[PDB]
Short mmCIF file of N, CA and C and ligand atoms in Angstrom, two decimals:
data_model
loop_
_atom_site.label_atom_id
_atom_site.label_comp_id
_atom_site.label_asym_id
_atom_site.label_seq_id
_atom_site.Cartn_x
_atom_site.Cartn_y
_atom_site.Cartn_z
N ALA A 1 0.82 -1.20 0.00
CA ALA A 1 0.00 0.00 0.00
C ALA A 1 0.85 1.25 0.00
N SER A 2 0.21 2.38 -0.26
CA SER A 2 0.86 3.68 -0.21
C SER A 2 1.16 4.05 1.22
N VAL A 3 2.05 5.02 1.41
CA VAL A 3 2.35 5.49 2.76
C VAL A 3 1.20 6.28 3.35
N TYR A 4 0.48 7.00 2.50
CA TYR A 4 -0.65 7.80 2.96
C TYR A 4 -1.76 6.92 3.50
N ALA A 5 -2.07 5.86 2.76
CA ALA A 5 -3.13 4.95 3.15
C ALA A 5 -2.60 3.53 3.13
N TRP A 6 -1.92 3.16 4.21
CA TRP A 6 -1.20 1.90 4.26
C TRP A 6 -2.06 0.74 4.73
N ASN A 7 -1.50 -0.47 4.71
CA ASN A 7 -2.22 -1.66 5.17
C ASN A 7 -1.86 -2.04 6.59
N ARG A 8 -2.86 -2.30 7.42
CA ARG A 8 -2.59 -2.73 8.79
C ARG A 8 -3.11 -4.13 9.04
N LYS A 9 -2.20 -5.09 9.10
CA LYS A 9 -2.60 -6.46 9.34
C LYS A 9 -2.46 -6.78 10.82
N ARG A 10 -3.54 -7.26 11.42
CA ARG A 10 -3.50 -7.60 12.82
C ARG A 10 -3.04 -9.03 13.02
N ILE A 11 -1.95 -9.20 13.75
CA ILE A 11 -1.42 -10.53 14.01
C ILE A 11 -1.44 -10.83 15.51
N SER A 12 -2.10 -11.93 15.87
CA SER A 12 -2.20 -12.32 17.27
C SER A 12 -2.55 -13.79 17.39
N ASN A 13 -2.44 -14.32 18.60
CA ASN A 13 -2.82 -15.71 18.87
C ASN A 13 -2.13 -16.70 17.91
N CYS A 14 -0.81 -16.50 17.71
CA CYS A 14 0.07 -17.27 16.83
C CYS A 14 1.51 -17.19 17.34
N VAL A 15 2.39 -18.04 16.80
CA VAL A 15 3.78 -17.98 17.19
C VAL A 15 4.58 -17.00 16.35
N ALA A 16 4.99 -15.94 17.01
CA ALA A 16 5.66 -14.84 16.36
C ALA A 16 7.14 -15.11 16.28
N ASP A 17 7.51 -15.95 15.33
CA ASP A 17 8.91 -16.30 15.15
C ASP A 17 9.63 -15.14 14.46
N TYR A 18 10.51 -14.46 15.20
CA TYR A 18 11.21 -13.28 14.70
C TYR A 18 12.64 -13.61 14.32
N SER A 19 13.02 -14.88 14.47
CA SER A 19 14.41 -15.25 14.22
C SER A 19 14.70 -15.27 12.73
N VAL A 20 13.66 -15.45 11.93
CA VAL A 20 13.79 -15.46 10.49
C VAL A 20 13.95 -14.04 9.97
N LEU A 21 13.10 -13.14 10.46
CA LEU A 21 13.14 -11.76 10.01
C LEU A 21 14.44 -11.09 10.43
N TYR A 22 14.89 -11.41 11.64
CA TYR A 22 16.13 -10.85 12.16
C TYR A 22 17.35 -11.35 11.39
N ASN A 23 17.43 -12.66 11.18
CA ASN A 23 18.59 -13.24 10.51
C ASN A 23 18.61 -12.98 9.01
N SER A 24 17.45 -12.81 8.39
CA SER A 24 17.39 -12.58 6.96
C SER A 24 18.26 -11.41 6.51
N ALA A 25 19.05 -11.65 5.47
CA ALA A 25 19.96 -10.65 4.92
C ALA A 25 19.30 -9.83 3.82
N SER A 26 18.04 -10.14 3.52
CA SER A 26 17.32 -9.46 2.45
C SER A 26 16.88 -8.05 2.85
N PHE A 27 16.98 -7.74 4.13
CA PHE A 27 16.53 -6.45 4.61
C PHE A 27 17.67 -5.44 4.61
N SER A 28 17.38 -4.19 4.23
CA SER A 28 18.41 -3.15 4.22
C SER A 28 18.59 -2.63 5.62
N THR A 29 17.53 -2.72 6.41
CA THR A 29 17.61 -2.33 7.80
C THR A 29 16.65 -3.14 8.65
N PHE A 30 17.04 -3.34 9.89
CA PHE A 30 16.23 -3.99 10.91
C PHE A 30 16.57 -3.32 12.22
N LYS A 31 15.73 -2.43 12.68
CA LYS A 31 16.06 -1.73 13.91
C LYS A 31 14.85 -1.63 14.83
N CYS A 32 15.09 -1.78 16.13
CA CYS A 32 14.07 -1.73 17.17
C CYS A 32 14.31 -0.53 18.07
N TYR A 33 13.24 0.02 18.62
CA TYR A 33 13.39 1.21 19.45
C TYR A 33 13.20 0.99 20.95
N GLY A 34 12.33 0.05 21.32
CA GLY A 34 12.06 -0.19 22.73
C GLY A 34 12.52 -1.56 23.22
N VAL A 35 12.70 -2.50 22.30
CA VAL A 35 13.06 -3.87 22.65
C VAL A 35 14.22 -4.39 21.83
N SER A 36 15.23 -4.94 22.49
CA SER A 36 16.37 -5.46 21.76
C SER A 36 15.91 -6.43 20.68
N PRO A 37 16.47 -6.35 19.45
CA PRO A 37 16.13 -7.15 18.30
C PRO A 37 16.43 -8.63 18.49
N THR A 38 17.25 -8.96 19.48
CA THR A 38 17.61 -10.35 19.72
C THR A 38 16.83 -10.97 20.87
N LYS A 39 15.93 -10.19 21.48
CA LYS A 39 15.12 -10.66 22.60
C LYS A 39 13.66 -10.75 22.20
N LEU A 40 13.39 -10.50 20.92
CA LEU A 40 12.02 -10.41 20.43
C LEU A 40 11.27 -11.71 20.60
N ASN A 41 11.98 -12.83 20.53
CA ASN A 41 11.32 -14.12 20.67
C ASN A 41 10.88 -14.41 22.09
N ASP A 42 11.57 -13.82 23.08
CA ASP A 42 11.27 -14.10 24.47
C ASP A 42 10.18 -13.20 25.03
N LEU A 43 10.09 -11.99 24.51
CA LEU A 43 9.07 -11.06 24.99
C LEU A 43 7.72 -11.41 24.39
N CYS A 44 6.74 -11.78 25.24
CA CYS A 44 5.40 -12.20 24.73
C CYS A 44 4.42 -11.07 24.90
N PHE A 45 3.96 -10.60 23.77
CA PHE A 45 3.10 -9.41 23.68
C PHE A 45 1.66 -9.82 23.52
N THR A 46 0.73 -8.88 23.65
CA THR A 46 -0.66 -9.24 23.44
C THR A 46 -1.02 -9.09 21.98
N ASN A 47 -0.40 -8.11 21.31
CA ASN A 47 -0.69 -7.85 19.92
C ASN A 47 0.51 -7.34 19.15
N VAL A 48 0.61 -7.74 17.89
CA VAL A 48 1.58 -7.13 17.00
C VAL A 48 0.86 -6.61 15.76
N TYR A 49 1.12 -5.37 15.40
CA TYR A 49 0.49 -4.81 14.22
C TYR A 49 1.50 -4.64 13.12
N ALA A 50 1.21 -5.20 11.95
CA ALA A 50 2.12 -5.08 10.83
C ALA A 50 1.65 -4.02 9.84
N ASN B 1 28.93 27.89 32.63
CA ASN B 1 30.32 27.49 32.57
C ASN B 1 30.47 26.22 31.71
N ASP B 2 31.50 26.22 30.83
CA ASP B 2 31.75 25.14 29.86
C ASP B 2 32.26 23.85 30.49
N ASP B 3 32.98 23.97 31.60
CA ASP B 3 33.50 22.78 32.24
C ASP B 3 32.42 22.15 33.08
N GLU B 4 31.58 22.99 33.69
CA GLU B 4 30.48 22.45 34.47
C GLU B 4 29.51 21.77 33.53
N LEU B 5 29.33 22.37 32.35
CA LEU B 5 28.43 21.84 31.36
C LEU B 5 28.95 20.51 30.83
N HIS B 6 30.26 20.42 30.60
CA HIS B 6 30.86 19.18 30.15
C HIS B 6 30.64 18.07 31.17
N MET B 7 30.78 18.40 32.46
CA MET B 7 30.52 17.42 33.50
C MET B 7 29.06 17.00 33.50
N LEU B 8 28.15 17.94 33.28
CA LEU B 8 26.74 17.59 33.18
C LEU B 8 26.52 16.66 32.00
N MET B 9 27.18 16.95 30.90
CA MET B 9 27.04 16.14 29.70
C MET B 9 27.43 14.70 29.97
N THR B 10 28.57 14.47 30.62
CA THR B 10 29.00 13.10 30.85
C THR B 10 28.11 12.40 31.88
N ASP B 11 27.51 13.15 32.80
CA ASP B 11 26.59 12.52 33.74
C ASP B 11 25.37 12.02 32.99
N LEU B 12 24.90 12.83 32.04
CA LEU B 12 23.75 12.47 31.24
C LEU B 12 24.07 11.31 30.32
N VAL B 13 25.30 11.26 29.79
CA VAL B 13 25.69 10.15 28.93
C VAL B 13 25.68 8.86 29.71
N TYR B 14 26.24 8.88 30.91
CA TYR B 14 26.25 7.67 31.70
C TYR B 14 24.85 7.18 31.98
N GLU B 15 23.99 8.07 32.46
CA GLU B 15 22.64 7.67 32.83
C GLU B 15 21.84 7.26 31.61
N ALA B 16 22.02 7.96 30.51
CA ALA B 16 21.29 7.65 29.30
C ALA B 16 21.64 6.27 28.79
N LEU B 17 22.92 5.89 28.90
CA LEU B 17 23.31 4.55 28.49
C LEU B 17 22.82 3.53 29.51
N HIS B 18 22.84 3.90 30.78
CA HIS B 18 22.42 3.01 31.85
C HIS B 18 20.99 2.54 31.63
N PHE B 19 20.13 3.46 31.21
CA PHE B 19 18.72 3.15 30.99
C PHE B 19 18.40 2.86 29.53
N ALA B 20 19.43 2.72 28.71
CA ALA B 20 19.23 2.48 27.29
C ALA B 20 18.93 1.02 27.05
N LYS B 21 17.68 0.64 27.27
CA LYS B 21 17.31 -0.76 27.15
C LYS B 21 17.57 -1.30 25.75
N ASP B 22 17.35 -0.49 24.72
CA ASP B 22 17.58 -0.99 23.37
C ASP B 22 18.91 -0.48 22.81
N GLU B 23 19.24 -0.92 21.60
CA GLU B 23 20.50 -0.59 20.96
C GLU B 23 20.47 0.75 20.26
N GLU B 24 19.31 1.12 19.75
CA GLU B 24 19.20 2.37 19.01
C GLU B 24 19.42 3.53 19.96
N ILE B 25 18.94 3.37 21.19
CA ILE B 25 19.12 4.41 22.17
C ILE B 25 20.59 4.55 22.48
N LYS B 26 21.29 3.43 22.67
CA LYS B 26 22.71 3.53 22.96
C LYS B 26 23.43 4.23 21.82
N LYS B 27 23.08 3.90 20.59
CA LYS B 27 23.74 4.49 19.44
C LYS B 27 23.55 6.00 19.40
N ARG B 28 22.34 6.46 19.68
CA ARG B 28 22.10 7.89 19.67
C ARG B 28 22.86 8.58 20.78
N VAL B 29 22.91 7.97 21.95
CA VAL B 29 23.60 8.58 23.07
C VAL B 29 25.09 8.68 22.79
N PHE B 30 25.68 7.65 22.20
CA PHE B 30 27.09 7.69 21.86
C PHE B 30 27.37 8.78 20.85
N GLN B 31 26.49 8.95 19.86
CA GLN B 31 26.67 9.99 18.87
C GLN B 31 26.63 11.36 19.53
N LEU B 32 25.70 11.53 20.46
CA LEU B 32 25.58 12.78 21.17
C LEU B 32 26.82 13.06 22.00
N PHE B 33 27.36 12.03 22.63
CA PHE B 33 28.61 12.18 23.37
C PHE B 33 29.73 12.65 22.47
N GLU B 34 29.89 11.99 21.33
CA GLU B 34 30.97 12.34 20.42
C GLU B 34 30.88 13.79 19.97
N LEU B 35 29.67 14.25 19.66
CA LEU B 35 29.51 15.62 19.22
C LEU B 35 29.88 16.59 20.33
N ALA B 36 29.46 16.28 21.55
CA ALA B 36 29.77 17.11 22.70
C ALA B 36 31.26 17.12 22.99
N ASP B 37 31.91 15.98 22.77
CA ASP B 37 33.33 15.86 23.06
C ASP B 37 34.10 16.77 22.11
N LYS B 38 33.71 16.75 20.84
CA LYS B 38 34.35 17.61 19.85
C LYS B 38 34.07 19.08 20.13
N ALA B 39 32.82 19.39 20.48
CA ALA B 39 32.45 20.77 20.77
C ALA B 39 33.23 21.29 21.96
N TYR B 40 33.41 20.45 22.97
CA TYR B 40 34.15 20.85 24.14
C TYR B 40 35.59 21.18 23.79
N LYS B 41 36.24 20.28 23.06
CA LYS B 41 37.64 20.46 22.69
C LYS B 41 37.84 21.72 21.86
N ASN B 42 36.86 22.04 21.02
CA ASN B 42 36.95 23.21 20.15
C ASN B 42 36.30 24.46 20.75
N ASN B 43 35.92 24.39 22.03
CA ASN B 43 35.32 25.51 22.74
C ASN B 43 34.06 26.06 22.06
N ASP B 44 33.23 25.17 21.52
CA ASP B 44 31.97 25.57 20.90
C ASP B 44 30.84 25.41 21.91
N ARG B 45 30.48 26.52 22.56
CA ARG B 45 29.52 26.49 23.65
C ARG B 45 28.14 26.08 23.20
N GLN B 46 27.75 26.52 22.01
CA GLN B 46 26.40 26.27 21.55
C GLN B 46 26.18 24.82 21.19
N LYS B 47 27.18 24.18 20.58
CA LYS B 47 27.05 22.77 20.26
C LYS B 47 27.03 21.94 21.53
N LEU B 48 27.82 22.35 22.52
CA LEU B 48 27.88 21.60 23.77
C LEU B 48 26.54 21.72 24.50
N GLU B 49 25.96 22.93 24.53
CA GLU B 49 24.67 23.12 25.18
C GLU B 49 23.58 22.33 24.46
N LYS B 50 23.63 22.31 23.13
CA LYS B 50 22.63 21.60 22.35
C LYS B 50 22.62 20.13 22.69
N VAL B 51 23.80 19.51 22.77
CA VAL B 51 23.84 18.10 23.08
C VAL B 51 23.28 17.84 24.46
N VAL B 52 23.64 18.68 25.42
CA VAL B 52 23.16 18.50 26.77
C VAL B 52 21.65 18.57 26.85
N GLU B 53 21.04 19.53 26.17
CA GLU B 53 19.59 19.61 26.21
C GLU B 53 18.96 18.38 25.55
N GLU B 54 19.55 17.89 24.46
CA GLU B 54 19.03 16.71 23.80
C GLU B 54 19.16 15.47 24.68
N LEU B 55 20.28 15.35 25.39
CA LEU B 55 20.46 14.23 26.30
C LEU B 55 19.44 14.27 27.43
N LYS B 56 19.14 15.46 27.94
CA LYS B 56 18.15 15.56 29.01
C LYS B 56 16.79 15.05 28.54
N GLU B 57 16.38 15.43 27.33
CA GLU B 57 15.09 14.97 26.83
C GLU B 57 15.10 13.46 26.61
N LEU B 58 16.21 12.95 26.10
CA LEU B 58 16.34 11.53 25.84
C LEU B 58 16.19 10.75 27.14
N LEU B 59 16.88 11.20 28.19
CA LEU B 59 16.82 10.51 29.46
C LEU B 59 15.43 10.59 30.06
N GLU B 60 14.77 11.74 29.94
CA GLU B 60 13.42 11.86 30.47
C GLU B 60 12.51 10.85 29.80
N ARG B 61 12.68 10.65 28.49
CA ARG B 61 11.88 9.67 27.79
C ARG B 61 12.15 8.25 28.29
N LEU B 62 13.41 7.96 28.63
CA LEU B 62 13.76 6.63 29.13
C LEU B 62 13.22 6.39 30.53
N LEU B 63 13.23 7.42 31.36
CA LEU B 63 12.79 7.30 32.75
C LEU B 63 11.27 7.36 32.94
N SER B 64 10.58 8.23 32.18
CA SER B 64 9.14 8.46 32.26
C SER B 64 8.43 7.70 31.15
N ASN C 1 -14.11 -4.08 16.60
CA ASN C 1 -12.75 -4.58 16.62
C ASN C 1 -12.70 -6.12 16.78
N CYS C 2 -12.43 -6.83 15.68
CA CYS C 2 -12.41 -8.31 15.71
C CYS C 2 -11.03 -8.80 16.16
N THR C 3 -10.78 -8.62 17.45
CA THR C 3 -9.48 -8.88 18.06
C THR C 3 -9.19 -10.36 18.29
N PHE C 4 -10.21 -11.18 18.14
CA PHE C 4 -10.09 -12.62 18.31
C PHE C 4 -11.11 -13.34 17.46
N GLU C 5 -10.67 -14.41 16.82
CA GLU C 5 -11.56 -15.28 16.10
C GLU C 5 -11.04 -16.70 16.14
N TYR C 6 -11.95 -17.63 16.36
CA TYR C 6 -11.63 -19.04 16.39
C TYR C 6 -12.74 -19.90 15.81
N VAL C 7 -12.37 -20.90 15.02
CA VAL C 7 -13.38 -21.83 14.52
C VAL C 7 -12.96 -23.28 14.79
N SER C 8 -13.89 -24.08 15.34
CA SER C 8 -13.68 -25.51 15.59
C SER C 8 -13.90 -26.29 14.29
N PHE C 9 -37.34 -34.90 26.82
CA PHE C 9 -36.07 -34.59 26.17
C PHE C 9 -35.18 -35.84 26.13
N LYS C 10 -34.27 -35.89 25.13
CA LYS C 10 -33.38 -37.03 24.88
C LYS C 10 -31.93 -36.76 25.27
N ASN C 11 -31.52 -35.50 25.25
CA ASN C 11 -30.14 -35.17 25.59
C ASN C 11 -30.02 -33.99 26.54
N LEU C 12 -29.03 -34.07 27.41
CA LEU C 12 -28.66 -32.98 28.31
C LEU C 12 -27.27 -32.47 27.98
N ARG C 13 -27.16 -31.16 27.82
CA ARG C 13 -25.89 -30.53 27.53
C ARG C 13 -25.55 -29.51 28.61
N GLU C 14 -24.57 -29.84 29.45
CA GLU C 14 -24.19 -28.96 30.55
C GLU C 14 -22.97 -28.13 30.17
N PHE C 15 -22.98 -26.86 30.54
CA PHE C 15 -21.87 -25.96 30.29
C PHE C 15 -21.54 -25.08 31.49
N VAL C 16 -20.27 -24.75 31.63
CA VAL C 16 -19.87 -23.75 32.61
C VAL C 16 -19.06 -22.66 31.94
N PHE C 17 -19.49 -21.43 32.12
CA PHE C 17 -18.83 -20.29 31.53
C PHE C 17 -18.25 -19.39 32.60
N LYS C 18 -16.93 -19.29 32.68
CA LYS C 18 -16.35 -18.39 33.68
C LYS C 18 -15.20 -17.59 33.09
N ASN C 19 -14.98 -16.40 33.61
CA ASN C 19 -13.95 -15.52 33.09
C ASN C 19 -12.95 -15.10 34.15
N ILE C 20 -11.78 -15.74 34.14
CA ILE C 20 -10.77 -15.46 35.15
C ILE C 20 -9.45 -15.01 34.55
N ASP C 21 -8.99 -13.85 35.00
CA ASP C 21 -7.73 -13.26 34.56
C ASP C 21 -7.66 -13.12 33.05
N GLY C 22 -8.79 -12.77 32.44
CA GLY C 22 -8.85 -12.53 31.01
C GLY C 22 -9.14 -13.78 30.18
C1 NAG D 1 -11.43 -0.27 16.55
O1 NAG D 1 -10.97 0.27 17.82
C2 NAG D 1 -10.87 1.75 17.83
C3 NAG D 1 -10.32 2.17 19.18
O2 NAG D 1 -8.91 1.99 19.23
C4 NAG D 1 -12.27 2.37 17.56
O3 NAG D 1 -12.18 3.79 17.52
C5 NAG D 1 -12.78 1.86 16.19
O4 NAG D 1 -14.09 2.40 15.95
C6 NAG D 1 -12.86 0.31 16.22
N1 NAG D 1 -13.25 -0.17 14.88
C7 NAG D 1 -14.24 -1.04 14.71
C8 NAG D 1 -14.61 -1.50 13.33
O5 NAG D 1 -14.89 -1.46 15.67
#
């Protein structure tokens, strides 16, 4: 989607495996602001919005 | 005073890193330190004050 | 807000519905 009117996918009640997204070299950047990028698998949240 | 300000700057750097739970925060704090360090050595009062004010806001965000 | 979704006289059907800690 466009930046003005983007897509918001609600993800919940599933296993949020972040080890693939983190390790993947296809990304130009992967940066976190409140939670270390290597602890994402251990922190269990109520909701993630993509 | 520039020396008192430099001491304030390093106090803020320490605390800002101390509470820097993530990596991006640490990176920004280190960059702010480096800029202040250069400003101090070159006697640039305005750059040194700017970093200090930015560090104060950063730390407030980490604490509150 | 559809925050959750899940899909799976001759008779008596007993049920208990309780809500604890969410
Ligand atoms: C979704 O939740 C928001 C509150 O965060 C509310 O304003 C909005 O109307 C809700 N949307 C729907 C379709 O219920």
